[PDB]
Amino acid sequence: SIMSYNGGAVMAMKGKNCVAIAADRRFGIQAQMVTTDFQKIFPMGDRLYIGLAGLATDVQTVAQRLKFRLNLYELKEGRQIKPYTLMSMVANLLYEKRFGPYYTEPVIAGLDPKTFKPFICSLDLIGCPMVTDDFVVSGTCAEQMYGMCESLWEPNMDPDHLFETISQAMLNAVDRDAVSGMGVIVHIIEKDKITTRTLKARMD
Amino acid sequence: MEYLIGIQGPDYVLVASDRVAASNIVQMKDDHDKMFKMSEKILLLCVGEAGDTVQFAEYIQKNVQLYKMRNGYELSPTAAANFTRRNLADCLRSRTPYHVNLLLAGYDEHEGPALYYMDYLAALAKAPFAAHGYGAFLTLSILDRYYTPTISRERAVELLRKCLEELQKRFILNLPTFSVRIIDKNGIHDLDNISFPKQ
Amino acid sequence: MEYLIGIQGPDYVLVASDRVAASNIVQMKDDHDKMFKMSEKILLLCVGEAGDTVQFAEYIQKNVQLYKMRNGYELSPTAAANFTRRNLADCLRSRTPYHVNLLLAGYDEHEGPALYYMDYLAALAKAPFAAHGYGAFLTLSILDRYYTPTISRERAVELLRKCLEELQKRFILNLPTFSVRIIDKNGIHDLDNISFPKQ
Amino acid sequence: TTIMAVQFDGGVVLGADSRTTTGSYIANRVTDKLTPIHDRIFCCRSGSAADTQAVADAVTYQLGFHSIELNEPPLVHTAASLFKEMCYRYREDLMAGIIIAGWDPQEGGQVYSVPMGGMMVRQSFAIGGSGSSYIYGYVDATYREGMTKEECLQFTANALALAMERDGSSGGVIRLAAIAESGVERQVLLG
Amino acid sequence: TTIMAVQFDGGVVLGADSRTTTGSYIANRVTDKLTPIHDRIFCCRSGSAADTQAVADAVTYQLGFHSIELNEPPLVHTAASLFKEMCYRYREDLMAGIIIAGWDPQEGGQVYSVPMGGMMVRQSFAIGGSGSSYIYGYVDATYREGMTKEECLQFTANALALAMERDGSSGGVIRLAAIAESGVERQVLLG
Amino acid sequence: TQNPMVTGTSVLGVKFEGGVVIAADMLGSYGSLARFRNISRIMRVNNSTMLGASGDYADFQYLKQVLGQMVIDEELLGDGHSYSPRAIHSWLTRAMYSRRSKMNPLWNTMVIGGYADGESFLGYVDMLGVAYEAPSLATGYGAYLAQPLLREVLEKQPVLSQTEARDLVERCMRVLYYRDARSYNRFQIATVTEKGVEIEGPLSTETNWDIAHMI
Amino acid sequence: TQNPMVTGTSVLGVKFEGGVVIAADMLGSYGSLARFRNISRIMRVNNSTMLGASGDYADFQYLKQVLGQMVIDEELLGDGHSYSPRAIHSWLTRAMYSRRSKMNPLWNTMVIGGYADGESFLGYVDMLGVAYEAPSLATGYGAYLAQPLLREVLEKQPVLSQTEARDLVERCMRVLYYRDARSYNRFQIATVTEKGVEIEGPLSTETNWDIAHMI
Amino acid sequence: TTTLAFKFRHGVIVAADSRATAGAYIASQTVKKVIEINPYLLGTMAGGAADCSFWERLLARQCRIYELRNKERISVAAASKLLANMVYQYKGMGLSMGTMICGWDKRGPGLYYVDSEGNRISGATFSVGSGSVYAYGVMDRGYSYDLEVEQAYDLARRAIYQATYRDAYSGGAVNLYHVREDGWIRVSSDNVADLHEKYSG
Amino acid sequence: RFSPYVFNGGTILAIAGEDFAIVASDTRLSEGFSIHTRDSPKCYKLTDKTVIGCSGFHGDCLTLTKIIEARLKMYKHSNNKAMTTGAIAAMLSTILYSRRFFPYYVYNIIGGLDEEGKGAVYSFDPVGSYQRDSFKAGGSASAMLQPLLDNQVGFKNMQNVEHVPLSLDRAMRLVKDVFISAAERDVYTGDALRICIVTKEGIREETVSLRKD
Amino acid sequence: TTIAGVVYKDGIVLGADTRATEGMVVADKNCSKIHFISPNIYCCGAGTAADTDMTTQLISSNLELHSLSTGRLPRVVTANRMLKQMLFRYQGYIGAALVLGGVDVTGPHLYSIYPHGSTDKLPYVTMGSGSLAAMAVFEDKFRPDMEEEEAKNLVSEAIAAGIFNDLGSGSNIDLCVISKNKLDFLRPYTVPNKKGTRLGRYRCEKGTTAVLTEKITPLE
């Protein structure tokens, strides 16, 4: 579909006291790939990232408009942004284009700015929020990542098992996926530090 | 249809257009020029619907000249790339959308050489070498066969001549003469025009 | 689509197809032959849907030889041309039509040389010089100013050269190599393969 | 257009309008919409004209042949079966509004209905035609079980009168039929 | 679905079924299909639902404001004119089955009809709705000029009874409305 | 109006010596159902001209409203000047043309009959703005059916009396009752002379059905 | 049949202890007009099986004819062997599949109920050949509407009595009378046991309307 | 989907991928595409699985009948002609089939290319599939007639690696077949990841 | 108008073991947004060493099952011996291409033992191609089940994980895990599970429930 | 999606099932379909999720404004009027299937809204895709002036029938009771579907995945 014009696959998974977001690396037109370095995970403040999947135009455009409104909010008020606030902001921005819709499925993954409470949520192409506790996925491939995460997820996970679980899920679901592949980037964040690893994915 | 290829080096960007301005049966103009010298270190190529290409030349060329005359210092290539992407993304959803295919060649004093890649759906890309049309396919194969990031410029000219000799053997188009530029620490240096007698 | 020319002389017929067997992007075979030597003085050229070309050549080329074996002699070019036209006109109003574009080149003992011209709707024509495809929009006017009925064969080969030189200057397809036949009082003689280095 | 059959105790009573229309123009101002097939069995037709004429002629053929081979008077349900088969088998091309009625020596008066589908049902009264819906509105109000012949005639008179008055496609003239054990009595109410 | 309005000498009598359907599924078994606007004027609606609800609200607004600026009781023809204007203005988008009736001090009982187009006419009786063709079949058969109140009640009872019985969209239950010089008398019946 | 809901039908009008007679019937059919079998389809404009229409009855009500407003305005000027029937014809044509030019056509077919200052007038207005004068006008199917009767007698005799014209209108309406499916046996005659405007009552026709006794 | 002209509506069947009860109504609606308000939509096959159908009534008549012919033929074999209900289910399934394969679908939805040799049977046949066994079947809108009642009571109690089943069918048919636009307050109950096949008469329902006195 | 075939001095090289998706969804990574028709013929699977499979099996049956009637092996061009004649009878009815006919002839090396559109042609190099153009590029870089054995192996293997690297509809194991004068032999079946580790540096 | 197909959904699993072929399937037959039953086992036991499962359009599944049984009996009554597994696979491929231009809308998985006595799973497609794989997940839940089997059966995308041959009982608990995990997120799956085991000694069946929504 | 409404002898009992699927796959197992409007009025949604959410938040904003400006408890009929006027203004483009309930000074009032703008007052409504099963259970066992526990059992039974029919929810039921005085709101009402335990620890070991590029960024 139009969601499968440039591909895309974003997974975010809630751990015990930490949260891990991962995406694919491929960018290209319908079957002809172009590059492997296309960024889909953005830093929106500290210890809180957003992921975007779908049409890459809307990806970059929504990321820049969100950055615009985010900077204006954080300069009117000296504190940084809470995750629910960002979720409502993204929902409002998408629902402004109720009938000229952007083709994207944002995924917000971040921590509490006061406590170490993890948070995950996803949104639809018109601004439907959905908070859960285990994992959210987006992009062209869905059912693969649903099957893997419903296979492997446990409730209370140290960051290493969290990292390995999201690793196996992304690798298997992307290797079964066709139009989205060519590498994995993994952000595993927590209260203390931010880690960014890339996996040896199959370049096929 | 036609294609204008651009390669990234250590300190140079090797772009190469064509000179074909055909309309649906016949080659009307055999010495067309698709190279838009925006500033002293920033090139621009354009492919698409030819009523739109001239007006992108107008808009972007004259507007970046406006920036230069206003402030006092030449743009970075990255800001120019984003400015073009923003203008396409704005003109996309309207009653008048623009359907072109760009790729940007620049060189900063601090960032060094840079090569970008547009689309008719306005996606930025930071690539080592690009593709549009069908010259896309039959260049990208060999060009991804032979690449080294630490490649000297005469090796790149040799690779490009070899790639063109592979082009002029399995197309269905004509493509006789290809104009070629290069960007260095100095500026836009025109190389010799690269045509080929086939048989 | 592709090209083939059909120049008649006083006592010779100079036909020349191409050697291109492309599929929509790439040139799969650059030495292909579209020539079907029917008899010792009758040639046939075909253009169109490449599933129909081989089939209709397989029909005619293996029916005229049957006539040859049965009767002990050879058809006229006229009757062969009309027989092909008859088979097209019968095949057209069916569930399986053929979409081909022929021209027949013959040589009688009595009528001498002869050229016919088919079409995808099965029309006979007794032409002095016919063509087909997109080239045929140019290469007939490149010819109709330098045609003389009493022209010698070296002038005719020169006029082929003069015409191909104007073909490969303003035409979007590639067409690198043309094969050339000639008919005489003896039979079918193949002249050399006419290719061009362009630039 | 609007056709109608009503049975009573002795026999049945039929009835139709005349006007055959095409588009908004009337081609024929007066038309025998009801047709004799056997001498005791009628049918009134609607929908297309040509289709129903052809079907009625074929039924006339088969039914007369069969009745001669029996050397007995035919049944009404048999002709109902014949229209049923001819309609249902070679449907998807026909517009049949066929109503079969007639008196029978074994069974008295009966009325069968064949709509555009091809189903067969036995009814006591029946409508048919595009402008039949309105008098179908009140034929279930005015009807009383156990009428006489004159009550049925007045009944269908009022019915077809309001059908002709209200719907644009109906109109023309009233033709009535009275089929019983005794004979066949046709008459034309006009004006 | 089917709405019915009869005037008599003293006043008018309205009436409807309920059964608001969406496709083949009944969404509402019981529905107020008749609407008070002023204290003496009703309107009963058909066609789509949301169109008629919004139109009834806007008419209620403008009419009440106008009648308070007169400091006089409104005419029924005034409300009919308002429906005419606001239905002809957006006739490309609405499906109006509006029938307005109501007693007036200057003019007695009156009945106006507004069909899907936007024309406005005065009638002595009115049908409306998709299941209205049948009782339209015999509303010119049973009606007699110069009825009483009870005759109009019994009349419309039989009308809506047969409409609900025959048509599949109609049904549910009968709502009646008695409007006169005296008061507004509504009741719910079944039978 | 894209889809006409409630159509009228054919309108007949013809001049005579010092007057114009128009007669159209009283039927408000919807689809094929004659839903409104008692309506008026001729407006009596002030003293000279007179309007008759077919097509969408609601649009005819709208034009009735606007023209009544215009005529009352000019009469309240008090200047002694009224509209000619030809001015009415011109205004109606311009209105219809500007209405169709915005692709929202008024589905109508109108006849303007007027007698002013010795000369009769009989004008036609179509939906597309097609407009002309004629000694006899027939709308709808009447242009197919009763128009040859008018053009037969007017070729047989170029002038007429009021009696002859009224009889001819009666016969044409009888014919339309015979073979028009959207016809009805109740019509009203309107007549203008210099004595004013006069609308006759809902007359009926006399029919024949003696062919029905043939098979 | 591409276009079903005269449709029936939903059929309800459910097993119980040593018997199967099937009940549908007696309505022949065309479009929305209830044109044939007295028809029988249940065939009582020979001794054990029993058929109920929906959709186009003409196709039901046709299949009624063909099945009657075949059952009469095996009864004229005179051997003592009959058709099991599941055999009829198989034959009807193959028939429907052969019809839809040739792009001539028989627009129906049929229910087969039979009791033979200790075992009950309640079969389903679609137009598309989808065919299965079930403890309770519901066609048309009944699969949306009365199916939850069946699946509630059959989950809460796996076996039943005849009285429980008959009462439950009565309740389900009352509900279908409440909220279905193609329904009618006249239905027949048909019940098979080992004692034979029996079709009860045109029963009706008891309604309630006390919600209408609320606003 | 990317297949290629080219003949040279030491016979014929045939390699293919093994990825056969379904829309955007990969069905299997290990679909063996090069259908082994005979002990002297090799056919491919180019566009559609069932059509290529079925018609090449029927062609194998036909050729075995021919050999049993003439006590003699069929030619390559004969099999291409038979396949073209069988495929041509369903023109327009929606068969996609772009296979390749390889094998050793009485004339020697034989390489034909038969379409569902019936483009029956000989040639020296071919490449079929979605990513076929990539194979054309890198092969017509590296192609000659006078190549060696290991050289030709590397050429074909590198070609399929580049094709699966750029295009998305290709991947899985890279099979490798080699037609000699007497019989065909499977060379090897290599995975993409092994080649990536081997050839990336 | 009349559309000749309708999507019933379903889920068929197969695992080619060393000397066992495990085929399992749920027994929910649905249509659109309704539930027709909670008992319709997709599996069918042909021979003592062959089990076939059929999903997709259900009527074509029934018709195909009956035709396969008929041709099985024809082969037996002609050639005095049962078929192999691959012979059945080839015959099914011939059938599915024999209705090419009016296709079956049916996914098919034939498991069973070979003539050596090893597991053999033959996948299929609507048009009639086949191949010998180690596992396939057919029907609606294909994408929910293929990557987990790629992780567990194939040991793929793993590092320093040696290859143990899949035992019987471990495969059993794998099938139970994947059907619970797939019945959580899929709508066309649940209400039972019919587990068929082919050994060197016969066919075993086993029914394990699921969640009832 | 199967939302229901009922009116017992004092107030309103609202229920819901909270499986929000996107196409064919269960996307959510817990989705709050019962939204806040006011301290006396609630609402449930069906169909397009985000349209219902944005519309119900806009109406709740407007009613909070109007109530705080007035200074007394709001009216259900005003909410009904705002919703029907807005949805009729959007010409039926916005798909929002709404159930509106609240207790005014006049008592309990239930309204069902169909997304074109047609509204009805009923003593019991069911909306959504699986609405027909709950409508079946209601038309089976409704009687006027039921009790508290009677109505709660009824609504639970209706939505349970909707869940045993298709497109219900694994979510166990959301309920809500609004009275003249006591507002309650109950998320985990009764769980029928316990997920079965795991049969195998499929644990990813610490180091089974090849890493190409590590990166550490400290924080505060």
From Swiss-Prot, chains F, G:
Gene Ontology CC: ciliary basal body; cytoplasm; cytosol; extracellular exosome; mitochondrion; nucleoplasm; nucleus; proteasome complex
Pathological association: Proteasome-associated autoinflammatory syndrome 3: An autoinflammatory disorder characterized by onset in early infancy and recurrent fever, nodular dermatitis, myositis, panniculitis-induced lipodystrophy, lymphadenopathy, and immune dysregulation. Variable accompanying features may include joint contractures, hepatosplenomegaly, anemia, thrombocytopenia, recurrent infections, autoantibodies, and hypergammaglobulinemia. Some patients may have intracranial calcifications. PRAAS3 inheritance is autosomal recessive or digenic.
Purpose: Non-catalytic component of the 20S core proteasome complex involved in the proteolytic degradation of most intracellular proteins. This complex plays numerous essential roles within the cell by associating with different regulatory particles. Associated with two 19S regulatory particles, forms the 26S proteasome and thus participates in the ATP-dependent degradation of ubiquitinated proteins.
Annotated protein name in UniProt: Proteasome subunit beta type-4
Similarity section: Belongs to the peptidase T1B family.
Source species: Homo sapiens (Human)
Keywords noted in UniProt: Acetylation, Cytoplasm, Disease variant, Host-virus interaction, Nucleus, Phosphoprotein, Proteasome
Disulfide bonds: none
From Swiss-Prot, chain H:
Positions annotated to bind bortezomib: A49
GO CC, any one term: proteasome complex
Annotated active site: T1
This protein's record includes keyword Cytoplasm: yes
Effect of A50V: Displays high resistance to the bortezomib, a proteasome inhibitor of the chymotrypsin-like activity
Main location group: cytoplasm
Inducing stimuli: Down-regulated by IFNG/IFN-gamma (at protein level). Induced in breast cancer tissue. Up-regulated by sulforaphane in breast cancer cells.
The keyword Hydrolase is assigned to this record: yes
Key words, A-Z: Cytoplasm, Host-virus interaction, Hydrolase, Nucleus, Protease, Proteasome, Threonine protease, Zymogen
Signal peptide limits: none
GO biological process, one term: response to oxidative stress
Catalytic activity: Cleavage of peptide bonds with very broad specificity
The protein's Enzyme Commission number: 3.4.25.1
Family: Belongs to the peptidase T1B family.
Oligomer status and interactors: The 26S proteasome consists of a 20S proteasome core and two 19S regulatory subunits. The 20S proteasome core is a barrel-shaped complex made of 28 subunits that are arranged in four stacked rings. The two outer rings are each formed by seven alpha subunits, and the two inner rings are formed by seven beta subunits. The proteolytic activity is exerted by three beta-subunits PSMB5, PSMB6 and PSMB7. Directly interacts with POMP. Interacts with ABCB1 and TAP1.
Protein name: Proteasome subunit beta type-5
Range covered out of full length: 60 to 260 of 263
From Swiss-Prot, chain I:
Glycosylation sites: S30, S181
Residues with the Phosphotyrosine modification: Y122
Subcellular location: Cytoplasm; Nucleus
Matches recorded under Gene3D superfamilies: Glutamine Phosphoribosylpyrophosphate, subunit 1, domain 1
Location, primary (coarse class): cytoplasm
GO cellular component, one term: cytosol
Entries under Pfam families matching the protein: Proteasome
Chain positions with N6-acetyllysine modification: K176
InterPro entries to which the protein is assigned, alphabetical: Ntn_hydrolases_N, Proteasome_bsu_CS, Proteasome_sua/b, Proteasome_suB-type
One example of a Gene Ontology biological process annotation: proteasome-mediated ubiquitin-dependent protein catabolic process
Phosphoserine PTM sites in chain numbering: S34, S40, S134
TM regions (residue ranges): none
Keywords in alphabetical order: Acetylation, Cytoplasm, Deafness, Glycoprotein, Host-virus interaction, Intellectual disability, Nucleus, Phosphoprotein, Proteasome
Complexes and interactors: The 26S proteasome consists of a 20S proteasome core and two 19S regulatory subunits. The 20S proteasome core is a barrel-shaped complex made of 28 subunits that are arranged in four stacked rings. The two outer rings are each formed by seven alpha subunits, and the two inner rings are formed by seven beta subunits. The proteolytic activity is exerted by three beta-subunits PSMB5, PSMB6 and PSMB7. Interacts with SERPINB2. Interacts with RFPL4A. (Microbial infection) Interacts with HIV-1 protein Tat.
Family, as annotated: Belongs to the peptidase T1B family.
Protein name, UniProt field: Proteasome subunit beta type-1
Native source organism of the sequence: Homo sapiens (Human)
Lineage of origin: Eukaryota, Metazoa, Chordata, Craniata, Vertebrata
Gene name linked to the record: PSMB1
Swiss-Prot record, chain J:
Catalytic activity: Cleavage of peptide bonds with very broad specificity
Gene: PSMB7
Tissue expr: Expressed at a low level in colonic mucosa. Up-regulated in colorectal cancer tissues.
A GO cellular component entry from the record: extracellular region
The EC number(s) this enzyme carries: 3.4.25.1
Active site per UniProt: T1
Gene Ontology molecular function: endopeptidase activity; threonine-type endopeptidase activity
Span within the parent record: 44 to 263 of 277
Localization per record: Cytoplasm; Nucleus
Subunit structure: The 26S proteasome consists of a 20S proteasome core and two 19S regulatory subunits. The 20S proteasome core is a barrel-shaped complex made of 28 subunits that are arranged in four stacked rings. The two outer rings are each formed by seven alpha subunits, and the two inner rings are formed by seven beta subunits. The proteolytic activity is exerted by three beta-subunits PSMB5, PSMB6 and PSMB7.
Enzyme's top EC category: hydrolase
Keywords tagged on the record: Cytoplasm, Host-virus interaction, Hydrolase, Nucleus, Protease, Proteasome, Threonine protease, Zymogen
Organism: Homo sapiens (Human)
GO terms under biological process: proteasome-mediated ubiquitin-dependent protein catabolic process
Main location: cytoplasm
Protein family: Belongs to the peptidase T1B family.
Protein name: Proteasome subunit beta type-7
Signal peptide range in chain numbering: none
